[PDB]
Ligand binder design. Structure first.
Ligand code: MG
Length: 56
């Protein structure tokens, strides 16, 4: 399924998507992307919209 990440960081803003079998797997994909960008914040997940948010 397609999951989304809302980047709501100090310098990085925007949204990324990933393809994943489940929410836990998507979270791993998004953590890798976030780490790549140096984004380091508070994570939440909403299953109704399959959307993660990371806020710095
Ligand atoms: Mg499970």
């Amino acid at each position: 399924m397609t999951y989304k990440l809302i980047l709501n960081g100090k310098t990085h803003k925007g949204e990324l998507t990933t393809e994943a079998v489940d929410a836990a797997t998507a979270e791993k994909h998004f953590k890798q992307h976030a780490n790549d960008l140096g984004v380091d914040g508070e994570w939440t997940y909403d299953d109704a919209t399959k959307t993660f948010t990371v806020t710095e």
